[PDB]
């Protein structure tokens, strides 16, 4: 009989079992969605949203509920850091239950369509055999798609009837779910504009309705019926697999690069924000905003939010991870407890020093202390036999400003080397390697894990597009070639 890899092709001939077998897959996907949301709520720690947020804890599908308005829980807590007085029915646990209740309803529907497979709807008139009108079937489902797209865009995102989406500031500090207005100019194609998301789904929803009305009425061309093999249920599979790896490269691309549909308070910062000095420049923009108005150092560094200094850290970079360094980001370096200050380095000639930060490539990186003009003055040398840039001889002291070590100075050449090696990792933080028994080496955020799956899926679905496009064009020669096929040579 069939091989092991060909068993599911018993469904290619009868449409009733095709309903039943997509219903079982749909029951498993929403059955995963509720079960993963129940698992994430049962392990989420909502205590510190400032310094232990959801992307720090390994929450994968909880930033997708929170992206579309679900901010409250049936345990009292919220995401923004307050108590929910009325959680409503659309909590995290209400939605985790609404997918399990839907999973059993789709389960029972699949059992129905498996037994009652021989419906009269699936047999076309006056030939009596099982047939599907795939140009009109597409016209139905494209019409429903643009109707939901326009419904999600005009009502859910815009806040006309639904709640809205997540919108934050540029620096990930002040972020809520609030309604957006659509933006119809050139600004709507800036993907860091949330208004272009609402303006997308209205315009693409209206066009998807109008295109759906086309494919409901206008039958295809005969020359384009044969050339795209429209009479097969597999030429829609090949083109749909082509549609979903295209989408999965775009989806994983905007997750990795960052977009308004991927906030950093939900998914963490991007690797291009550590590389391009995104938060470091703003932290310096706010210190220099205070030293110019007239203030002390330790009174200016206290005015920086502890959440902003946590984005400026290599351990929250999604590209400082490993493929088998599994779990939460808190499992790597610990749960962040408090910002420990801003390490400022001075040598014995009264000159400031600046630690060259670890680039994103480097697993290990030598610590270097550069001056204002960019010249190395101190380091922790590898050879200490005849050194000329050692911290011991240059006389590097370290003072902190703000944080838990405010106004405290360290001149001990063992202590200074410890904080110089923490200052190349970013801002200085205090962790606990005892709460989760942390390994000591970093992990990747859900922004990095989502991107890893959805490019590995988008690449394996390129091959499935190649396989299933080949099985439609070469449907007649699937079991082998003809015996007299030697006419193709000279």
């Amino acid at each position: 009989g069939l091989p092991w890899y060909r068993v599911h092709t018993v469904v290619i001939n009868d449409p009733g079992r095709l309903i039943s077998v997509h219903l079982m897959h749909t029951a498993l996907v929403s059955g995963w969605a509720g079960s993963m949301a129940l698992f994430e709520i049962s392990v989420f720690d909502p205590s510190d949203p400032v310094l232990n947020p959801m992307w720090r804890q390994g929450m994968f599908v909880l930033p997708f509920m929170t992206r579309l308005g679900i901010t409250q829980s049936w345990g009292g807590w919220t995401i923004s850091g307050e108590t929910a007085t009325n959680p409503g029915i659309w909590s995290y646990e209400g939605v985790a239950a609404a997918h399990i209740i839907l999973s059993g309803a789709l389960f029972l529907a699949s059992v129905w369509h498996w037994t009652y497979w021989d419906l009269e709807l699936f047999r076309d008139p006056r030939t009596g055999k099982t047939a599907l009108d795939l140009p009109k079937i597409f016209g139905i489902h494209l019409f429903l798609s643009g109707l939901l797209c326009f419904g999600f865009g005009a009502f859910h995102v815009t806040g006309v009837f639904g709640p809205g989406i997540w919108v934050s500031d540029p620096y990930g500090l002040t972020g809520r779910v609030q309604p957006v207005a659509p933006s119809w100019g050139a600004d709507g194609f800036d993907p860091y504009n949330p208004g272009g998301i609402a303006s997308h789904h209205i315009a693409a929803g209206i066009l998807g309705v109008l295109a759906g009305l086309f494919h409901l009425c206008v039958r295809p061309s005969i020359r384009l019926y044969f050339g795209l093999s429209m009479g097969s249920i597999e030429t829609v599979l090949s083109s749909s697999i082509a549609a979903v790896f295209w989408a999965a490269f775009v989806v994983a691309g905007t997750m990795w690069y960052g977009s308004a549909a991927t906030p950093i308070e939900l998914f963490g910062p991007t690797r291009y924000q550590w590389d391009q000095g995104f938060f470091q420049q703003e932290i310096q923009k706010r210190v220099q905003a205070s030293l110019a108005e007239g203030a002390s150092l330790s009174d200016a560094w206290s005015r920086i939010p502890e959440k902003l200094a946590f984005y400026d850290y290599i351990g929250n970079n999604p590209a400082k991870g490993g493929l088998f360094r599994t779990g939460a980001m808190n499992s790597g370096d610990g749960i962040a407890v408090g910002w420990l200050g801003h390490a400022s380095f001075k040598d014995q000639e009264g000159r400031e020093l600046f630690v060259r930060r670890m680039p994103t490539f480097f697993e290990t990186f030598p610590v270097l202390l550069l001056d204002k003009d960019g010249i190395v003055r101190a380091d922790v040398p590898f050879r200490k036999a005849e050194s000329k840039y050692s911290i011991e001889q240059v006389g590097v002291s370290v003072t902190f400003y703000g944080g838990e070590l405010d106004g405290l100075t360290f001149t001990d050449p063992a202590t200074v080397k410890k904080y110089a090696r923490k200052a190349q990792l970013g801002e200085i933080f205090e962790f606990d390697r005892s709460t989760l028994q942390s390994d000591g080496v970093f992990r990747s955020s859900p922004r990095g894990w989502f991107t890893f799956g959805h490019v590995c899926f988008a690449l394996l679905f390129f091959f499935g597009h190649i396989w299933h496009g080949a099985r439609t064009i070469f449907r007649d020669v699937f079991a082998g070639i003809d015996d007299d096929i030697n006419d193709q040579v000279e």
Partner: peptide, 24 residues
């Protein structure tokens, strides 16, 4: 003492402040 540009030059040097307008 130090500009925000030549504090992000000796610390990262890939900085979006340090890379743009760098024709001077």
């Amino acid at each position: 003492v130090t500009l925000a540009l030549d504090k992000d030059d000796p610390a990262k040097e890939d900085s979006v402040k340090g890379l743009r307008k760098d024709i001077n």
